[PDB]
Design a protein around this ligand. Structure first.
Ligand SMILES: CCCCCCCCCCCCCCCCCC(=O)OC[C@H](COP(=O)([O-])OCC(O)COP(=O)([O-])OC[C@@H](COC(=O)CCCCCCCCCCCCCCCCC)OC(=O)CCCCCCCCCCCCCCCCC)OC(=O)CCCCCCCCCCCCCCCCC
Ligand SMILES: CCCCCCCCCCCCCCCCCC(=O)OC[C@H](COP(=O)([O-])OCC[N+](C)(C)C)OC(=O)CCCCCCCCCCCCCCCCC
Ligand SMILES: CCCCCCCCCCCCCCCCCC(=O)OC[C@H](COP(=O)(O)OCCN)OC(=O)CCCCCCCCCCCCCCCCC
Ligand code: SF4
Ligand code: SF4
Ligand code: SF4
Ligand code: SF4
Ligand code: SF4
Ligand SMILES: [K+]
Ligand SMILES: [Zn+2]
Lengths: 48, 114, 94, 206, 38, 94, 386, 45, 145, 176, 154, 112
C-alpha cells in the first residue's frame, strides 16, 4: 500500500511465482487473489 | 357486410393487381439471380414464384387479396433495392431442412406429431 | 459422504451418477465431474441436540436478521427431537 | 396522506370541460370522452375522424396540440376490432396533453396522419410492421423494425413470444439460414393471477 | 365508399403462421376450472 | 500531487488554470471504505395504533375513468395558457 | 448515386449500428434512408410476460447511457397507475441521480460527437469522469450501469454512509473539466466549421416532426418538461434552461454543455437539501418490507412472498407518462388490465422521432455533415429499436 | 439508538462552481501584429 | 388484511399428528376453521377428527394415535385453507405458479371424475379435482388423487 | 427560467475587428487548444496497473453467484423457488424433494449465466440469504457450456468465496 | 528441429498476443463498458490493444451486445472478411447466449451460432475490468498455441 | 421593432396590428359559411372576436402581447393563419353533423 498515491493505485499485489503447482512467474491473473485479500485489494474494506 | 375497401372494390379489380405483381416478379427473377449471384436457375426461381402465388388461389375476399398484393410488392421492393442480402432471398428454398415425412407411417415412426 | 459407483464416477449429494451404459459420461473424459464434497445431510447430523427447559423454543438460525425467519418449535413429544424446518438444528426438552 | 398520490381537482375539471368542448365541436366522429382519476383526457373517435379530429386539435386556437408525442396500437383479440390506435398529443401553448383513440381490424385501412404530423411517418410504419395495420396514403409504408422477409406481426397477442423461425450459420451452404424454432429450454409459463379480486371499484357486472 | 363482401372472414393467408400450425392444431375454448386448493 | 514545482507551473501556464486546486485524481479527500453501521429510520406507517390500512390504501382509491360524454357557453382551452418564461438573472447570456 | 454509411466507426463506439442508405449528387446528400431494426429485440412484447418489477430492468437497457432516467420514467408511470406516492427522500435521490445520469449522457453525447468528427482527445479526458460516476452507480446499486435502483415506490436501497461527501468531491471539480472541454471545441474554428449552420431545423418543423429536448431548444423553443410539467422534486430546485438561437448543430452543442453546468448546479442543491426518512413507500403491498421485518413478522413475510412471486396488482387503466430524459422526452404508454403483469407497454424513445428527421435535416449538406447531424441528435439505437 | 443516515453536514456543503470560466489571455490584435511585423523587420535587416 | 404486524409476543406451537401416509400434518399452521372435521363427519362419514382442549390451546386431531384412512381422505388437503394438511407424496416438489394445468378425466373407476393434471416441464406433478356438479362435485377418491 | 447560449453581437469597432483579424491570421485560438493538450502531457495519468491493481468496488457489487450455508454446514436454501419466480431472465431452474432426513432441499439448482442479467433480484427475494451474487467478476471461460452452472458449481462457489461473501453481507445487511 | 520449432512458436505467439488489434461491434450496452476499457483508467492500448483498427486489419472481433436476426448476416460477413489468425470474444449475456432477450423472436440465442467464439465474458454488462480479464485470458490462450510443433510432426 | 422572434424560421413582422386585423376578419368571413348552430362557428367566432377587440384597443405591440397570452406577436399571427386554414377544412368535413356510426357494443370497454 501507498496512501500517497491516488485512489486506485494506492494498493497493489505482487503475485507469487508459483501457485497450486503452476508456474506463474510470467503467467499471473486476477483470479489468483484469495477471497480474504480480494476484499481488501478491491477497496471493499479498509482493513486487510 | 358493407366494409371499407383497401384498393380493389371487387375480385375482378383485385385479380388485375395480382397479375401485375406476377409480371413484376416474373421479370425480376433473372436480375435477382444475377445480382445476388444465386446458384439456382432462373427456371427454379420462377417456379418458386408460381408456387407462392398458387397457394393463395382459393382466396375470394378482395380485401385479403389486396393485403396479399401489398405484402408481395413490399417483398419485391426489398429484393429490387437490394435491401435483402443473399441469405434473405434463399430462405424461400429451405435448402438445409430435411424433407418432412408426409404419410401416416412415416410420421408414426418419427414421433407423436400428426 | 461422497462415494464412487462401480464405474468410478463420484455420486453427488443428490444421488446423481451416470449408469454404466450412459453415453453422457463422455463429457467428463479428459476433464472432471464437478462434485461438492461437504454434504449438508452429514454436516447437520453432526450438530449436538440442544437441551432447553420449555415446551416451546424459537429458532432464527443464528445471526438475528442474518439467519432465517423466526419459527417456534413444540417439544411436547419425548420420543423425538424438535427440528427446525429452516436450518435443521434439533432441540429437546430437558 | 404520505403514501397516497394526491388528487388534482382543478385539472380534472379543466380537462372535463375541454372534453365536452371537443365533443360538441366534432360530434360527427367523437364516440366517447373520459378523464382518468390521474387526469388524462381521452377522446374515443370513429376511425373516419382521424384526420379531421387531429387537424382540429393541432390547428384550433384553443387546442394547439402541435406535437405528436406518440402513436401506437394495442391488440385486444376479444374485440371485433382488435386493434386500438392511440394518438398521444402535446400542446405547448396550454401545457397540456390529450389522447385520441380509434380502432380497426385486420382488413380495414386507417388514414395516414402524416399530413397532420410528419412525426407519424415512422410510427405508422412501426404499427404496420408490428401489428399489421395498413395505413392508407402513406408515402413509404414498409417494415421498419423486423428482419427483411419476416412473416407475421410480432406484437399481436397470438404471435408466439419466440416466433416461428430462428437463425444460425450453416457451413454447407456458407450463409445464415432460417429454420423452425427449437428451444433447449422452453419458456416456463407462470400462472400468477390470484383467485381473489383486488379492486372492487372496477368490478364488472355478473 | 363501402363495398360488400359476402364471404367468410378468413386471414389464414396473411398472418404468417406456418401451415402445419394452422391445420394440425386443436384449440380448446373453455372457462378455466377453479383451482380447488383455494 | 507528486509533480515537481516547476512542472506544476508549466502545466498551469499551458492550461491557463490553477489545476492543482482541482485535481482530477483522488487522494485522501474520499470517504473511508469502511464506515460505521447505519441506523435507518422507518416510514410513517410504523405505528402501533391508529394505523388501519384502509385509511392509507392508495390502490383502493383509484377509480375507473369519468365518462364525460358517451354515444351509447364560453370557449375553453385544455388549461390556462402557459406563462412566459423569465430570462435568467444568474447569467442571461452565455 | 447511392451509398451506405458503415455500421459504426473504426474506433470503439457505443450507440448501436445503423444502415444508412444515401442518395448523393456530387458531394451533396439528396436523400437519407435510415434502415433501423438492427437492435430491435422485442422488448415491448417481452414486458408482457413479466411482472411490473420484472420489467423494470428492461428500461436500463433502452437508452443504455441514461439508465436511471429510464427507470424513473417507468417508475413514475407505475406509481401513477398505483395511485401511490414515493417518499420525499426517494424523490430527492431520484432527482440527484437523474442529474448525475444527465452528466453521464451528455459526456457521452458531446465527446463521442467530437470523437466521430475526429477530435478524439476530449473523449479520454471526460470518460475518466464517467468512470467516477459509474462508481456512484455501483455504490448505491452494486452495478456500474444497469442499476435497477429506481423502482415504483421509491429506490431499492438507501445511500451508503459517505456517498454524499464523495459526490460533493466529484461535483467540486467538474466545472473545470467542462471548461477544458470547451477550450478544445467552443471557439475552435475547425469545430465551428464542422457544426455551425449544419442541420438547421426551424421551430415549427421541429414541433411537427415530433422532436423534443435539445432538438426543440436549439431552435429557440422554450420547453423543458422539468419546468413545465415537473415530476418528483424538480419544482424545488433552481436551474436555467439553455436556449439556442440558430437551430444548428453548434447551438445544440452549446445547449448540451450548458445543460451539464446546470446539472452540476442542481446536484449542488440536492446534496444540500437531502431530507431524512425512508426510501420506499411505506406500503408493504407495493414495496417489499425490510429484511428484518420479513424474518420476524407474519404479515411482512407474506407480503415479501407475494411481491416476489405474483407481484403487486395495478388497477386497470392506461397512462402516458413522460420525463425530460437527457435525450429528450422519454415516455411510456403503460396499459394495465388489473393483474400483476402489464397488458401493453409502448416506449416513446426521443431518438425515434429524431432519426426520422435525419432525411429532412441533411438536405443540401455534404456526406460528412451527416456524421455531425446524427451526432447532434445523440442517437442510441437501444431506445430507437426497443 | 439515534437514526444514522447519509446526510449533508451541518450548515451544508461548501460552494460548487458551475459557470463557464474561460480566462482572457493574450495581447490585443494591435500588439500581436506589431510583434509579428517587428520580427519580420528584424529578420529582413 | 393490513400490510404489517403489531404482535410483539411469542407464538403458539403445537405438536404434529400422524394420520397416515397420505396426509402430512403441520398443525402449527392450523387456523381452527374445522373444515376437515366437518368434511370428515358429513362427507366421508368418519367421526375421527375433532377438537381437543380449549381456548388458544384448542387442537384439531384425533386425540389418540389414529390414521384417517378413507377412500375420500385426500380431499381434506384441498379444503384445508392453509398448509396444515398437505399431500405427503407431493411434498416439496413444485410451486403452484409454475405448474401447467390440464383438465382431464379419471380412469381409476367408472365414475369419470373430472380432474386437473398438474404438470411441470414435461412431468406429472399431482392430480386435483375439477368441479362437476353432476359427477364428482369437487371431490376425488384417494386412488384418483 | 432560461438563458441564451449563443446570442452575442460582435463589436464592430476597429480594435475589436483587428482582434478578430489577428485570431484568423495568427491562429491564436488554435494555439490555445495546443496549450490544453500540452498541460495534460505533464499531468499524471489515471491508468491503474491491472491485474496488479484493481478498480475500487463496494460491498453491494453484484458479481458471480454462490449458494450459501449456515455455520453448521447445512445449506441455507430450502427450495422455496422465490428466486426462480422473480428472475427477470428465467435463468434459474429448481427441482426439490424431501431429503433422506425429511428436510426440504433442492435436487436441481441451475443458473444459466448466459441468460442472467446480474440484477440481484434473486438475492433480494431469497428469505434465508441462500443465493447471493458474490464479489468475483473474473470468471470468463473458453466455452459456452462452462457458464451453465448446476448446484455443485454454485455450492463450490459458496464454499470458495464464503469468507468474503459473509464480510460483504455483514457490511451491507443494515441497508437491506 | 524440435528445439527451433518450440522457440519459433514462442516468438510468433509472443508477437500475436502482444499486438492484438480489435474490431468491436458496438451493438448495444456492452459497448459502453468496452469504451471504458479504452478510457484512461484501464487503457487497453497500453497492452498493445490499439484503439481503432478496421475490419481488414483486426485480429480479434469483440461482439459487444445483442445480436439480432437482422444483424446476424452482417456480423458473419465481417468475420468472413477478417484475415487470419482471427479470434472472437463474446462479451456479455446477450452475445453469450441471448441473455435477457433469449426468448425473443428476433434475437440470436448466442453469437456462437453464427461464429466460433474463443472467450466468453459473463456479465450484463461485464465490468470494464471483467472484459480486460477476458482479453488477457485470450492472450494466455494464444500463448498456449503450438502451430509449428503440430506442423513439424505432420 | 424587434431584431428576432427568437424562433428559428419565424421572421419578425413590421406591421403586426394590421396583419392581425386582416387575419381575424378573414376568419370571421369564412366562419359565415358554417351553419349557425355548429359549435365550431359559435366558439371560433367568440374567441376570434375577443382577440380582434384586443388588437383594436391596444396599439403597443409589447402591451398587446400580455393581453393575448399567445407568445410573440408573430406566434399569434401564425396561429391565426392556422385557424383560418382549419376553418376552411371544416367546411368540407362538416363535423357538426350527427355521429357517423356507433362503435360495436364493447369497443371501448376496459378491462375486457
Ligand atoms: C532524446 C531526449 C530523450 C533522452 C534524454 C532523457 C532525459 C533523462 C530522463 C531521465 C528521467 C528519469 C525520471 C526520474 O527522475 O526518476 C524518477 C522516478 C520516480 O520518481 P517519482 O517519485 O515518481 O517522482 C516523479 C515526479 O514527482 C513527477 O514527475 P515530474 O513531472 O514532476 O518531472 C520530474 C522531472 C523529470 O525530468 C527528467 O528526469 C528528465 C528531464 C529531461 C527533459 C528532456 C526533454 O522533471 C522535472 O523535475 C522538471 C525538469 C524536467 C525538464 C522539463 C522540460 C519540459 C519540456 C520543455 C517544454 C517542451 C514542450 C514540448 O523513477 C523512475 O521511475 C525511473 C524511470 C526511468 C524512466 C526512463 C528514463 C530514461 C530516458 C531514456 C533513456 C534511454 C533508455
Ligand atoms: C528479433 C528480436 C525479437 C526479440 C524477441 C522478443 C521477445 C520479448 C519477450 O519475450 O519478453 C519477455 C516475455 C515477457 O513475459 P510475458 O509476455 O509472458 O508476461 C510478462 C508479465 N506480464 C504479462 C504480467 C506483464 O517473456 C516471455 O513471456 C517468454 C516469451 C519468449 C518469446 C521470445 C522468443 C525468442
Ligand atoms: C503551444 C503553447 C500554448 C501556450 C498556452 C496558450 C497561450 O498562452 O496562448 C493563448 C493566447 C491567447 O489568445 P486568445 O485566447 O485566443 O485571445 C485572442 C487573441 N488575443 O494566444 C496566443 O498568444 C497565440 C500566439 C501565437 C503566436 C503566433 C504564432 C506564429 C507561428 C510561427 C512560429
Ligand atoms: S381444515 Fe386445516 S385449518 Fe381448518 S381445522 Fe382442519 S387442519 Fe385446521
Ligand atoms: S403459505 Fe399460507 S399456510 Fe403456509 S405458512 Fe404461509 S400463510 Fe401459512
Ligand atoms: S441476478 Fe437477476 S437475472 Fe441473474 S439469476 Fe438472479 S434474478 Fe435471475
Ligand atoms: S435460493 Fe433462496 S429463494 Fe431460491 S429456492 Fe433457495 S431458499 Fe428459495
Ligand atoms: S449483455 Fe446486458 S449490458 Fe450487454 S447488451 Fe445485453 S442487456 Fe445490454
Ligand atoms: K391445504
Ligand atoms: Zn433454524
Amino acid at each position: 500500500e501507498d496512501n500517497k498515491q491516488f485512489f486506485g493505485r494506492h494498493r497493489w499485489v505482487i503475485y507469487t511465482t508459483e501457485m497450486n503447482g503452476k508456474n506463474t512467474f510470467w503467467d499471473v491473473d486476477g483470479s489468483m487473489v484469495p477471497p480474504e485479500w480480494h476484499r481488501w485489494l478491491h477497496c471493499m474494506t479498509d482493513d486487510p | 357486410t358493407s366494409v371499407k375497401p383497401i384498393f380493389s372494390r371487387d375480385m375482378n379489380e383485385a385479380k388485375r393487381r395480382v397479375r401485375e405483381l406476377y409480371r413484376a416478379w416474373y421479370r425480376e427473377v433473372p436480375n435477382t439471380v444475377h445480382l445476388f449471384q444465386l446458384d439456382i436457375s432462373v427456371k427454379q426461381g420462377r417456379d418458386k414464384v408460381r408456387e407462392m402465388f398458387k397457394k393463395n388461389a382459393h382466396i375470394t375476399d378482395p380485401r385479403v387479396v389486396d393485403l396479399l398484393v401489398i405484402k408481395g410488392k413490399m417483398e419485391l421492393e426489398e429484393t429490387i433495392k437490394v435491401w435483402k442480402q443473399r441469405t434473405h432471398v434463399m430462405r424461400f428454398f429451405h435448402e438445409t431442412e430435411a424433407p418432412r415425412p408426409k404419410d401416416f407411417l412415416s410420421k408414426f415412426y418419427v414421433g407423436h406429431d400428426p | 459422504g461422497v462415494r464412487t459407483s462401480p464405474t468410478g464416477e463420484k455420486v453427488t449429494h443428490t444421488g446423481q451418477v451416470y449408469d454404466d451404459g450412459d453415453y453422457r459420461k463422455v463429457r467428463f473424459v479428459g476433464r472432471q465431474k464437478e462434485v461438492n464434497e461437504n454434504f449438508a445431510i452429514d454436516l447437520i447430523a453432526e450438530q449436538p441436540v440442544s437441551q432447553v427447559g420449555s415446551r416451546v423454543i424459537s429458532c432464527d438460525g443464528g445471526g438475528g436478521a442474518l439467519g432465517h425467519p423466526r419459527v417456534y418449535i413444540n417439544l411436547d413429544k419425548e420420543t423425538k427431537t424438535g427440528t427446525c424446518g429452516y436450518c435443521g438444528l434439533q432441540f429437546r426438552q430437558q | 396522506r404520505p403514501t397516497v398520490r394526491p388528487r388534482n381537482d382543478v385539472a380534472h375539471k379543466q380537462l372535463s370541460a375541454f372534453g365536452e368542448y371537443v365533443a360538441e365541436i366534432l360530434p360527427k366522429y367523437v364516440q366517447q370522452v373520459q378523464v382518468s382519476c390521474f387526469n388524462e383526457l381521452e377522446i374515443c373517435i370513429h376511425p373516419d375522424g382521424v384526420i379531421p379530429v387531429l387537424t382540429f386539435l393541432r390547428d384550433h386556437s384553443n387546442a394547439q396540440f402541435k406535437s405528436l408525442a406518440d402513436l401506437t396500437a394495442v391488440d385486444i383479440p376479444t374485440r371485433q376490432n382488435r386493434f386500438e390506435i392511440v394518438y398521444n398529443l402535446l400542446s405547448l401553448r396550454f401545457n397540456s396533453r390529450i389522447r385520441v383513440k380509434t380502432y380497426t381490424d385486420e382488413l380495414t385501412p386507417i388514414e395516414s396522419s402524416v399530413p397532420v404530423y410528419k412525426a407519424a411517418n415512422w410510427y405508422e410504419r412501426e404499427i404496420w410492421d408490428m401489428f399489421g395495420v395498413f395505413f392508407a396514403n402513406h408515402p413509404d409504408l414498409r417494415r421498419i423494425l423486423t428482419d427483411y422477409g419476416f412473416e407475421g406481426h410480432p406484437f399481436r397477442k397470438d404471435f408466439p413470444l419466440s416466433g416461428y423461425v430462428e437463425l444460425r450459420y450453416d457451413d454447407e451452404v456458407k450463409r445464415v439460414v432460417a429454420e423452425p424454432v427449437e428451444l433447449a429450454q422452453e419458456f416456463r409459463k407462470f400462472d400468477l393471477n390470484s383467485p381473489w379480486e383486488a379492486f372492487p371499484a372496477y368490478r364488472q357486472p355478473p | 365508399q363501402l363495398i360488400t363482401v359476402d364471404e367468410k372472414l378468413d386471414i389464414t393467408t396473411i398472418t404468417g403462421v406456418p401451415e402445419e400450425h394452422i391445420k394440425t392444431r386443436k384449440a380448446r375454448i373453455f372457462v378455466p376450472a377453479r383451482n380447488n386448493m383455494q | 500531487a507528486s509533480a515537481t514545482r516547476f512542472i506544476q507551473w508549466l502545466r498551469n501556464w499551458a492550461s491557463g488554470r490553477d489545476l492543482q486546486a482541482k485535481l482530477q485524481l483522488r487522494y485522501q479527500e474520499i470517504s473511508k471504505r469502511t464506515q460505521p453501521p447505519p441506523k435507518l429510520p422507518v416510514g410513517p406507517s410504523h405505528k402501533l395504533s391508529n394505523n388501519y390500512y384502509c385509511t392509507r390504501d392508495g390502490r383502493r382509491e383509484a377509480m375507473p375513468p369519468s365518462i364525460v360524454m358517451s354515444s351509447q357557453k364560453k370557449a375553453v382551452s385544455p388549461a390556462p395558457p402557459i406563462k412566459r418564461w423569465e430570462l435568467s438573472q444568474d447569467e442571461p447570456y452565455l | 448515386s447511392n451509398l451506405t454509411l458503415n455500421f459504426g466507426p473504426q474506433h470503439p463506439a457505443a450507440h448501436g449500428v445503423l444502415r444508412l442508405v444515401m442518395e448523393l449528387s456530387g458531394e451533396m446528400v439528396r436523400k437519407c434512408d435510415p434502415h433501423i431494426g438492427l437492435l430491435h429485440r422485442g422488448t415491448e412484447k417481452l414486458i408482457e410476460y413479466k411482472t411490473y418489477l420484472q420489467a423494470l430492468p428492461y428500461f436500463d437497457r433502452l437508452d443504455y447511457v441514461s439508465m436511471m432516467c429510464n427507470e424513473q420514467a417507468y417508475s413514475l408511470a407505475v406509481e401513477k397507475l398505483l395511485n401511490i406516492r414515493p417518499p420525499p427522500r426517494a424523490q430527492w435521490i431520484r432527482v440527484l441521480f437523474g442529474e448525475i445520469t444527465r452528466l453521464l449522457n451528455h459526456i457521452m453525447a458531446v465527446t463521442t460527437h467530437a470523437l466521430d468528427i475526429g477530435a478524439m482527445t476530449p473523449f479520454f479526458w471526460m470518460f475518466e469522469e464517467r468512470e467516477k460516476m459509474f462508481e456512484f452507480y455501483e455504490r448505491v446499486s452494486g452495478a456500474r450501469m444497469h442499476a435497477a435502483y429506481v423502482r415504483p415506490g421509491g429506490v431499492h436501497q438507501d445511500l451508503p454512509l459517505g456517498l454524499m461527501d464523495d459526490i460533493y468531491e466529484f461535483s467540486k471539480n467538474f466545472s473545470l473539466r467542462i471548461d477544458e472541454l470547451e477550450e478544445m471545441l467552443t471557439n475552435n474554428r475547425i469545430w465551428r466549421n464542422r457544426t455551425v449552420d449544419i442541420g438547421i431545423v426551424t421551430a415549427e418543423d421541429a414541433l411537427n416532426y415530433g422532436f423534443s429536448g435539445v432538438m426543440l431548444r436549439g431552435s429557440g423553443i422554450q420547453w423543458d418538461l422539468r419546468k413545465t410539467q415537473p415530476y418528483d422534486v424538480y419544482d424545488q430546485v433552481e436551474f436555467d434552461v439553455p436556449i439556442g438561437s440558430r437551430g444548428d448543430c453548434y447551438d445544440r452543442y452549446l445547449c448540451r454543455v450548458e445543460e451539464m453546468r446546470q446539472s452540476i448546479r442542481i446536484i449542488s442543491q440536492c446534496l444540500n437539501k437531502m431530507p431524512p426518512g425512508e426510501i420506499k413507500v411505506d406500503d408493504a403491498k407495493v414495496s417489499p418490507p425490510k429484511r428484518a421485518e420479513m424474518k420476524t413478522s407474519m404479515e411482512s413475510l407474506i407480503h415479501h412472498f407475494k411481491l416476489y412471486t405474483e407481484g403487486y396488482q395495478v388497477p386497470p387503466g392506461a397512462t402516458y407518462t413522460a420525463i425530460e430524459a437527457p435525450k429528450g422526452e422519454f415516455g411510456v404508454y403503460l396499459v394495465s388490465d388489473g393483474s400483476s403483469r402489464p397488458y401493453r407497454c409502448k416506449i416513446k424513445a426521443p431518438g425515434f422521432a429524431h432519426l426520422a428527421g435525419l432525411d429532412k435535416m441533411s438536405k443540401g449538406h455534404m456526406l460528412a455533415d451527416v456524421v455531425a447531424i446524427i451526432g447532434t441528435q445523440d442517437i442510441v439505437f437501444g431506445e430507437v429499436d426497443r | 439508538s439515534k437514526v444514522k443516515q447519509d446526510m449533508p453536514p451541518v450548515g451544508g456543503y461548501g460552494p460548487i462552481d458551475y459557470k463557464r470560466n474561460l480566462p482572457r489571455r493574450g495581447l490585443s490584435g494591435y500588439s500581436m501584429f506589431a510583434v509579428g511585423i517587428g520580427a519580420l523587420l528584424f529578420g529582413y535587416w | 388484511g393490513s400490510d404489517r404486524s403489531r404482535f410483539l409476543e411469542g407464538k403458539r406451537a403445537v405438536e404434529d399428528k400422524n394420520i397416515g401416509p397420505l396426509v402430512k400434518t403441520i398443525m402449527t399452521r392450523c387456523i381452527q376453521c374445522t373444515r376437515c372435521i366437518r368434511f370428515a363427519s358429513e362427507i366421508a362419514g368418519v367421526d375421527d377428527l375433532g377438537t381437543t382442549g380449549r381456548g388458544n390451546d384448542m387442537q384439531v386431531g384425533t386425540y389418540i394415535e389414529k390414521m384417517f384412512m378413507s377412500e375420500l381422505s385426500g380431499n381434506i388437503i384441498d379444503i384445508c385453507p392453509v398448509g396444515a394438511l398437505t399431500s405427503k407424496p407431493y411434498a416439496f416438489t413444485a410451486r403452484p405458479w409454475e405448474t401447467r394445468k390440464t383438465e382431464s378425466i379419471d380412469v381409476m373407476d367408472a365414475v369419470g371424475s373430472n380432474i386437473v393434471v398438474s404438470t411441470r416441464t414435461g412431468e406429472v406433478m399431482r392430480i386435483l379435482p375439477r368441479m362437476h356438479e353432476d359427477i364428482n362435485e369437487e371431490w376425488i377418491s384417494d386412488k384418483t388423487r | 427560467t432560461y438563458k441564451y447560449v449563443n446570442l452575442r453581437e460582435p463589436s464592430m469597432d476597429m480594435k475589436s475587428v483587428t482582434d478578430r483579424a489577428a485570431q484568423t491570421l495568427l491562429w491564436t485560438e488554435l494555439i490555445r487548444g495546443l496549450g490544453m493538450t500540452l498541460s495534460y502531457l505533464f499531468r499524471e495519468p489515471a491508468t491503474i496497473n491491472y491485474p496488479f491493481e484493481k478498480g475500487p468496488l463496494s460491498p453491494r457489487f453484484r458479481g458471480e453467484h454462490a449458494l450459501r450455508r449456515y455455520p453448521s454446514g447445512e445449506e441455507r436454501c430450502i427450495a422455496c423457488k422465490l428466486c426462480e419466480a422473480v428472475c427477470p431472465a428465467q435463468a434459474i431452474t429448481i427441482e426439490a424433494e424431501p431429503r433422506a432426513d425429511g428436510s426440504r432441499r433442492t435436487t436441481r439448482y441451475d443458473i444459466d449465466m448466459t441468460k442472467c442479467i446480474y440484477c440481484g433480484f434473486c438475492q433480494e427475494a431469497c428469505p434465508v440469504d441462500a443465493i447471493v451474487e458474490g464479489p468475483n467478476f473474473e470468471f470468463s471461460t473458453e466455452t459456452h457450456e462452462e457458464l451453465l452452472y448446476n448446484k455443485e458449481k454454485l455450492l463450490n462457489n459458496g464454499d470458495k468465496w464464503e469468507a468474503e461473501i459473509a464480510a460483504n453481507i455483514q457490511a451491507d445487511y443494515l441497508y437491506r | 528441429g524440435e528445439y527451433v520449432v518450440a522457440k519459433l512458436d514462442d516468438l510468433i505467439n509472443w508477437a500475436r498476443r502482444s499486438s492484438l488489434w480489435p474490431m468491436t461491434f458496438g451493438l448495444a450496452c456492452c459497448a459502453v463498458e468496452m469504451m471504458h476499457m479504452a478510457a484512461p483508467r484501464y487503457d487497453m492500448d497500453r497492452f498493445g490493444v490499439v484503439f481503432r483498427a478496421s475490419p481488414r486489419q483486426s485480429d480479434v472481433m469483440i461482439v459487444a451486445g445483442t445480436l439480432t436476426n437482422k444483424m446476424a448476416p452482417a456480423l458473419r460477413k465481417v468475420y468472413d472478411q477478417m484475415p487470419e489468425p482471427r479470434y472472437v470474444v463474446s462479451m456479455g449475456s446477450c452475445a453469450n447466449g441471448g441473455g435477457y432477450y433469449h426468448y425473443s423472436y428476433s434475437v440470436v440465442r448466442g453469437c456462437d451460432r453464427i461464429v466460433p467464439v474463443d472467450i466468453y465474458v459473463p456479465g450484463c454488462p461485464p465490468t470494464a475490468e471483467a472484459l480486460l480479464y477476458g482479453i488477457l485470458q485470450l492472450q494466455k490462450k494464444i500463448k498456449r498455441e503450438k502451430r509449428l510443433r503440430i506442423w513439424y510432426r505432420r | 421593432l424587434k431584431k428576432t422572434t427568437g424562433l428559428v424560421g419565424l421572421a419578425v413582422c413590421e406591421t403586426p396590428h394590421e396583419r392581425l386585423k386582416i387575419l381575424y376578419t378573414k376568419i370571421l368571413d369564412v366562419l359565415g359559411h358554417i351553419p349557425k348552430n355548429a359549435a365550431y362557428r359559435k366558439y371560433t367566432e367568440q374567441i376570434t372576436n375577443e382577440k380582434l377587440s384586443m388588437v383594436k384597443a391596444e396599439p403597443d405591440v409589447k402591451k398587446l402581447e400580455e393581453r393575448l397570452q399567445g407568445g410573440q406577436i408573430e406566434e399569434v399571427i401564425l396561429q391565426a393563419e392556422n385557424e383560418l386554414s382549419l376553418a376552411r377544412k371544416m367546411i368540407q368535413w362538416k363535423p357538426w353533423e350527427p355521429l357517423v356510426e356507433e362503435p360495436p357494443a364493447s369497443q371501448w370497454k376496459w378491462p375486457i
